[PDB]
Amino acid sequence: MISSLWIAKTGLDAQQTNMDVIANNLANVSTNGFKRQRAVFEDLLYQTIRQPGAQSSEQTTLPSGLQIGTGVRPVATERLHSQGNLSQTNNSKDVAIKGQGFFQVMLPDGTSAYTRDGSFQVDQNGQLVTAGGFQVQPAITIPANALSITIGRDGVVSVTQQGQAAPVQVGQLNLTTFMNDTGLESIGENLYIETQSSGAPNESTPGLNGAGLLYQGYVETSNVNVAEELVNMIQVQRAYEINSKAVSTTDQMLQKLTQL
Amino acid sequence: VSVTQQGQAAPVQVGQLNLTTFMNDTGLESIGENLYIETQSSGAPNESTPGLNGAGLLYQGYVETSNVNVAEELVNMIQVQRAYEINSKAVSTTDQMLQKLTQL
Amino acid sequence: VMLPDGTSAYTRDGSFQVDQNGQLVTAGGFQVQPAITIPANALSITIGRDGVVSVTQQGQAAPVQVGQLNLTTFMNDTGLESIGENLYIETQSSGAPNESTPGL
Amino acid sequence: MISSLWIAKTGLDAQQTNMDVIANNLANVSTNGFKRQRAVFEDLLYQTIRQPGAQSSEQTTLPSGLQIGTGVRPVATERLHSQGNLSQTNNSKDVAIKGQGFFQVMLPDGTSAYTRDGSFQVDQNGQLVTAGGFQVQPAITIPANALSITIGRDGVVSVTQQGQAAPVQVGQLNLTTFMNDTGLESIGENLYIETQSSGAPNESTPGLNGAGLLYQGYVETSNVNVAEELVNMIQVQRAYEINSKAVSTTDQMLQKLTQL
Amino acid sequence: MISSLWIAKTGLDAQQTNMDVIANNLANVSTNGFKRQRAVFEDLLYQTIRQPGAQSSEQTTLPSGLQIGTGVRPVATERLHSQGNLSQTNNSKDVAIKGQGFFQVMLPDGTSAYTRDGSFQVDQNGQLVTAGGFQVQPAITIPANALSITIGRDGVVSVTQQGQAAPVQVGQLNLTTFMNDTGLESIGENLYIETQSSGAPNESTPGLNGAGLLYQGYVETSNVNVAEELVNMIQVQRAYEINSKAVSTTDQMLQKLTQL
Amino acid sequence: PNTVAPVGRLKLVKAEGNEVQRSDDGLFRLTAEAQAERGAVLAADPSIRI
Amino acid sequence: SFSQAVSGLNAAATNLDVIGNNIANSATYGFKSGTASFADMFAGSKVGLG
Amino acid sequence: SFSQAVSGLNAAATNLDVIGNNIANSATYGFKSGTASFADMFAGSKVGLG
Amino acid sequence: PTGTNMQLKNVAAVMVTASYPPFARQGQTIDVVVSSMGNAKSLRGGTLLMTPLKGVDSQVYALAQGNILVGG
Amino acid sequence: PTGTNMQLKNVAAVMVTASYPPFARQGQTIDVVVSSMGNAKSLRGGTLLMTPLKGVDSQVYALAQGNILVGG
């Protein structure tokens, strides 16, 4: 219909996307190891009309001619991969990361996913799985009658047996680090899969090459900060309201055209 | 740009953020996705270090937001709408005058 | 304002832009007379009440005087010839263009 | 397109500027060495129409003829350079000013800036710098094995070394005073630079002809009075209400003319 | 979307940072060898709507032009390095520092951290370690047949064996001092690592050119003061509420601007 | 867009009604008297603005 | 800033647990008292975790 | 009034710390008691700073 | 003054080229060619100010000054 | 000054090519071909400034300067 209607429609869609990101951040306050999202916006096309820099006279130029812009579109969603605050759950099976590493688990399809959530359980077979039942590559199998599980700062998992004064080692919890952590593709279930923009999976022990340290009995809470989300909700509501007012103004203009 | 690696007690310099300064900023051509290309009205892009030769400083952890003033745009919408309603009435008056003229 | 043919027109639209070679020009690009040339290293451009154009340069606690934006006054302003592109040219009934420093 | 709408738009912009100043003042409450700002407005031009004082009739003149005014416009924002209340942080490096002086620092560009904030640290080389890493003139060098740093009322910085009953003087902290203190250009980062409206920087000893006294272990908090800000926020909100109502009334009048 | 909203959205974040610092200080009121934090703030951009000092006429300058400012940003949280009160635990393995030095401890990755915590333990191999299991320099070993451990004011560690009237020296404890102690990077677990703003690690003996003295049977408590933190919570809460009120006033202005 | 360069200038002429005559194809041409005084081809006027 | 204070609350609760356990064993042959040691959880400096 | 009152609070705390130090050193050979001296921090003469 | 804005319109910077003739003696006159060097529209009726004509060895062999003749 | 903006319009950078004739003696003259090198519209009435013509061995064998003749 009219250019301004399309531009304001794009603005409304962008503000709705911002509100969607806000709601997703707010709904995941209690999720362990969750990273908040941010939307990036860019200008749409620019109708050229007059060429800026064209020759107006034999010795004068046209400064900053008539460029008419289209609406707005979101560029991309970026996460804030930073250290969330730790919470003590007093559980021997929960591990938290202090640096910038990921746990590698195996999906039922055989491909490997990566999760920062440390809420682990032990299945009927004794293998350390996550809350959803995925097997946390690699192995960490657990003996039958364990009394206590000790996971050190460098990923060494040990089991204290009865009548034995020395703990036995049953695995080695490793961490995977990526060149670009924001490029990992989120699939839900607190799981990230590899992409071509997330570099390559660098397997390493906790403490070397940058990989973080593991704390037993702690969980990494989400990094969502509420006050920013509330102020952004106010921003989104008011910007949406302004764009709806612009749509209404275009509607009244068109109606006045129709009456004549 | 300095990068701190594990073990090293001294950061390692990696690169330099060079700011491009134009002498006529508004003469740039907006090519779309938050990018401007130089034109004949904004020639001679001068590379410089931030803070020197009139260039600006860099604040890390902050992003410059849009400078759109909101009340100005709303008052301007009011002006535009009523103006499009007074020009449409001028069109209608001319149409009625023509209809009366060509009717005889 | 200096027209391309070489004769002078007069305008009241004060929306100006600096062209690639500094120089203050109107929205159409015509150079505004007599010229005011703003350098590249300027951090802030101020046009005073009297029309003195001073710019701030880095490290210089004092402003650099660039130019005076003198105006032109006619006797019967209503007699000017409006040539279109927001420009007035002097006519028989609006002669004697008197340049003056604004405020005087 | 109509005069009253431009006037009300100018009023709205002025009230928004006042609210922006208020928000900036309230955002810097915890900033040390901060001075609150107040904006001053002026009216804009005045349409002549009927020149007052003209001959109304051969023997009489027009008293106070027909002048039509335009909107309003902000002249300037003046700082309130008054001693912000002091606070004891019990730190040997925090310095507060009791009078009307400023500390001088060197920017990386080589130019000299002036700051009133006295939260000082020491760099790796032993020189006294500000929180932003800028080196405070006159460049007091603190030696490696210092036990206590004493900064007196007159600006002498002394270091007491081990086993020596006498303190070693390592610098002299001076204060710069300006003829026009409000004319300085604030660049942010608690830094003001000299302009041509701020006179020239007069160096002086802290206790002499009008430089203030330096207190060690004290910080000068901001002078923002918050209850005044709340009352002014109420005032600004109501004024913006009234200006928006004027805009809406003008909108309603033009509608009837369109209908004509 | 409007200036005052961004300014009051920076005020909220700065006050939230201040509350975070206060809460972190209050949470660690009992950890030994703790240094409390202090957040410092600085002014953001200043829009030169009217540059101060501009030449309006050819002879009259404009004093203190229209310098509308942006919000606030925090420079950093600095550690208040003061001597915490010493207590008497009477455990031959607890040592407290009296000056401004640090203990050197070897991290598992081969690098050295620096800690002021004096609660030392003995591992299964007989080495002095930090309570987190990190082996402290210079690797002072303690025999199995030890009857009493004596750490003197000069850091000399002596062990008296059975039936022998003379003590056996098993090492010498040294203290590391820095030019700037604030610039050290805290890595948690009461550990600080060297940063280029902290100069270089100067090793020294306890009583010479500026290392502190060691007292055995003593623990250095934190320097956090509860009453000051309570008062600071009150002021920060009020400032946050007032900035939120500014946000609300801006929201109302925008609403009743749109409603006309 | 830096490549923008001038190529050619349109020929703009100045002629009143009394000098031009509409040819049979709708294109105006100089009348005989006017052509005899102004020449065969009209020189471009630098004052014309499009 | 909620987790930071929750951690301090938990630390105080642990301290009071230790004190209560020590008090309850005032008269218990062969009992050795307990003492809780705390360490901060700084992430990358400039921010605290509790 | 939240910076003039904080100053008085800190002064009273310092006085009480001095008194407690005097009390704790009741039996300490060669000890000398301590006292605190306070002074106002006026500025203009109409604006008190605590 | 060093800090000032001069915006001229009647001055052009030019390069002057000439031929040093065989057996040339001091006091004789030669023809020169004057060519503009930067963004000058025309040199219709300009006058060449005192110009020293250097050789390859960067020594002055002639002094040039006169009125330029442009075809028109 | 090193930091400055020069935006010329009457100057073109060109490459000059010539043939060194057999038994050439110093003082004789040869014809040269002048070809523009970057984004120049025309060389209609330009004048070639002093140009040293190098050989393959990067030694100056001729010095070029004159008025260019472009067909038109």
Q: Which of D109, D110, D194 sits opposite C61 (nearest CB)?
A: D194
* Helix-helix angle H4-24:E226-258, to 10 degrees: 160
- Which two structure tokens, joined as six digits, stand for A69? 């812009």
Contact A101, A212 (CB under 8 A): yes
D83 near H CB under 8 A: yes
Length of chain C, in residues: 104
* Maximum Cα interatomic distance, chain I, rounded to a whole number of Å: 48
Extract the tokens encoding E176: 């590391």
- CB spacing of D132 vs E252 below 8 angstroms: no
- Enumerate the H helices of chain A as residue ranges: 3-27, 226-259
What single-letter DSSP state applies at residue D57?
B
Helix (H, G, I), strand (E, B) or coil at H15: helix
| Cβ-contact I8, I21 below 8 angstroms | no
Instruction: Say which of E50, E51, E56 has its CB closest to residue C50.
Output: E56
Q: What's the angle, vertex CA E97, arms to CA E92 and CA E99, rounded to 5?
A: 160
Contacts of E22 (CB under 8 A, 6+ apart): E229, E232, E233, E236
Give the Å distances, CA to CA, from A28 to A31, A32, A35, A149, J17. 5, 9, 9, 30, 75
Mutate which: B52, B75, B93, B96, vs D, most D CBs within 10 A: B75
**Contacts J63 to I, Cβ<8 Å:** 56
Contact G49 A221 (CB under 8 A): no
Q: Please tell me what resolution, in angstroms, this structure has.
A: 4.1
Helix (H) or strand (E) holding E240: helix E226-258
Which residue has tokens 């942006």? E70
User: What is the enclosing helix (H) or strand (E) of C82?
Assistant: strand C81-82
**Are C29 and A56 within 8 A, CB to CB?**
yes
Query: What is the C-alpha separation between I55 and I61, in angstroms, rounded?
Result: 7
Contact yes or no for A3/A9 (Cβ under 8 A): no
Q: Which residues of D94-113 are buried (b: 16+ CB within 10 A; e: fewer)?
A: bbbbbebbbbbbebeeeebb
Pick C59's closest partner by Cβ from D111, D195, D196: D111
Within 52-71 of B, beta carbons closer than 8 Å to J belong to 53
Q: Residue F32: CA atoms inside 13 Å, Cβ hemisphere, count?
A: 0
Q: How far apart are CA A35 and CA A84, in angstroms?
A: 8
The set of residues, in sequence order, having a beta carbon less than 8 Å from that of E58 and lying 6+ positions away, is C48, C50, C52, C68, C101
Burial of E106 (C-beta count, 10 Å sphere; 0-12/13-18/19+): middle
Q: What are the Cα distances from residue J28, in Å, to I23, I61, J34?
A: 16, 21, 19
Taking a C-beta distance cutoff of 8 angstroms, is the pair E195, E182 a contact?
no
Neighbouring residues of I47: CB distance < 8 A, sequence distance ≥ 6: I65, I66, I67, I68
CA E249 to chain centre: 38
| Experimental technique used to determine this entry | cryo-EM
What token pair was written down for C25?
A: 């020009």
Of D133, D126, D112, D128, the closest CA to residue D216 belongs to D128
I15 → closest Cβ in J6, J7, J49 = J49
β-partners of residue D193 are D185
List, in sequence order, every beta strand (DSSP E) within E89-182.
95-97, 102-106, 112-115, 120-122, 128-130, 148-151, 156-160, 168-172, 175-177
Instruction: Judge whether E78 is closer than 8 Å to chain G, CB to CB.
Output: no
Q: Rounded to whole angstroms, how far apart are CA atoms B95 and A152?
A: 88
CA-wise closest residue to B22 among B41, B35, B3, B7 = B41
Residue burial E126-137, b: 16+ Cβ < 10 Å; e: rest: eebbbbbebbbb
**Token output for E1:** 């979307």
Residue labelled with tokens 């007699």 = C79
